[PDB]
Amino acid sequence: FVEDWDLVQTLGEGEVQLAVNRVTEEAVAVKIVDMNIKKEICINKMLNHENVVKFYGHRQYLFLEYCSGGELFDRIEPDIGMPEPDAQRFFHQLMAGVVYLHGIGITHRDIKPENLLLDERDNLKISDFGLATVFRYNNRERLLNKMCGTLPYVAPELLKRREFHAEPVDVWSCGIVLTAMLAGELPWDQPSDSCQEYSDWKEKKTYLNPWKKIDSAPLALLHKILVENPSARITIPDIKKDRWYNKPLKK
Ligand SMILES: Cc1cc(Nc2cc([C@@H]3CCCNC3)nc3c(-c4cnn(C)c4)cnn23)sn1
């Protein structure tokens, strides 16, 4: 009966259910797909990091690490965000996971609070590799060209360029996640000049929301992350040297 699992509840939406082993009572998340899939499983097989959802196997039923703390999305209070020290810790963990992925040549392509999960100790784990892809193989980088992601979190170069580097796109989405955590608000519907909010940011009108709600230190980091030119955008190694990133915080 050790291999017997009970589907006890739907975790959300294409469906993710919580499964409990009838013997050990161990919990796991089961991604059910009707019946791209082969790629997801393959990519999942390469993953082994504390801030990345673990893959156990597949029977389609993808057996993955269950995160009891739910989505980071649910820890963000509308119009408020969350305490700065909590945001910083989640950000550190997100960067750790992203550094790991980039280190193995994998780009997530859809980083957003709905995909960042929390374990029993509120440790952040990057989930869902359904849109992920290889951007580096045999030490050679491949440029991306496919439209992937979620508008409010997507980097501007996806909409303006035929080809673009993978890493700066994930960095940008991490910057939008940080903004959400600190302001409880997404800055724009999409990173296009047609969105007044995006133009306002490029004109540095930081006296407006959501920027006005964010302290100068993390805001200085956002100024380096949310840079339109991906080639001028801060890289992860430099984010790790940022003043706010290294600021001791405590509630
Ligand atoms: C208390 C509690 C815990 C939850 N836990 C929970 C929620 C969700 C949602 C489902 C809807 C989309 N956003 C993520 N996905 C997962 C996964 C998981 C692992 N790999 N993948 C692909 C998903 C593991 N736990 N988990 S939800 N409520």
Alpha carbon of residue 158 to chain centroid: 17
**Cis, peptide link before residue 248, omega less than 30° from 0:** no
Distance of CA 217 to the CA centre of its chain: 22
- Say how many C-beta atoms besides its own lie within 10 A of residue 82's C-beta: 17
Nearest ligand 1 atom to the CA of 16 is 10
- 228 with 198: CB under 8 angstroms? no
Phi-psi category of residue 58: left, alpha or beta, with phi > 0 → left and psi -120 to 50 → alpha: beta
**What residue segments make up the domains of the chain, in order of their start?**
1-77, 78-251
- Residue 183 DSSP class: H
| Nearest of 179, 190, 184 to residue 155 by alpha carbon | 190
What is the CATH T-level fold of the domain 78-251, as seen in this structure? Transferase(Phosphotransferase); domain 1 (1.10.510)
Q: What is the DSSP letter of 235?
A: P
CA dist 166 and 164 (Å) reads: 6
Distance 152 CA to ligand 1 centre (A): 21
Q: β-strand 27-32 against 106-107: which pairing, if any?
A: unpaired
What is the rounded distance in angstroms from the CA atom of residue 179 to the CA atom of residue 84? 11
Q: Are 30 and 36 in contact (CB under 8 A)?
A: no
Query: Quick one: 170 exposed, middle or buried, by C-beta within 10 A (0-12, 13-18, 19+)?
Result: buried
| CA–CA dist 210, 83 (Å, integer) | 15
Q: Residue 168, preceding bond cis, omega within 30 degrees?
A: no
State the structure-solving technique.
X-ray
CB-neighbour burial class of residue 16 (10 A; exposed 0-12, middle 13-18, buried 19+): middle
> What's the token pair of residue 226?
């949310």
Asked whether the domain spanning 78-251 has the same topology as the one spanning 1-77, the reply is no
Radius of gyration from C-alpha coordinates of the chain: 19
Q: How many CA atoms lie within 13 A of 72 on its CB side?
A: 29
12 is in an annotated binding site: yes
Report domain 1-77's class.
alpha beta
Backbone φ and ψ for 212, nearest 5 degrees, come out as -60, -25
Question: How far apart are alpha carbons 148 and 134 in whole angstroms?
Answer: 14
| Residue type for position 65 | E
Ligand 1 center from residue 117 Cα (angstroms): 7
What is the number of residues in the chain?
A: 251
Token couple for 218: 């993390």
Cβ(215)–Cβ(222) below 8 Å: no
Cα torsion angle, 98, 68, 122, 111, sign: positive
Helices and strands: H and E segment counts in the chain: 7, 12
Q: Is 11 annotated as a binding residue?
A: yes
Does residue 127 line the site of ligand 1, with CB under 6 A? yes
Please indicate if the annotation marks 13 as binding a ligand: yes
Tell me if 93 CB under 6 Å of ligand 1. Answer: no
Collapsing DSSP to helix, strand or coil, 200 comes out as helix
Q: Residue 68 C-alpha to ligand 1 middle, in angstroms? A: 8
Among 35, 34, 40, 41, CA closest to 58? 41
How many CB atoms are closer than 10 A to CB 192?
Answer: 14
Encoded tokens for 142:
């491949």
CB atoms within 10 A of CB 165: 20
Phi-psi region of 109 (alpha: psi -120 to 50; beta: other; left: phi over 0): left
Tokens matching residue 206: 């930081």
**CA atoms of 94 and 88, how far apart (whole Å):** 10
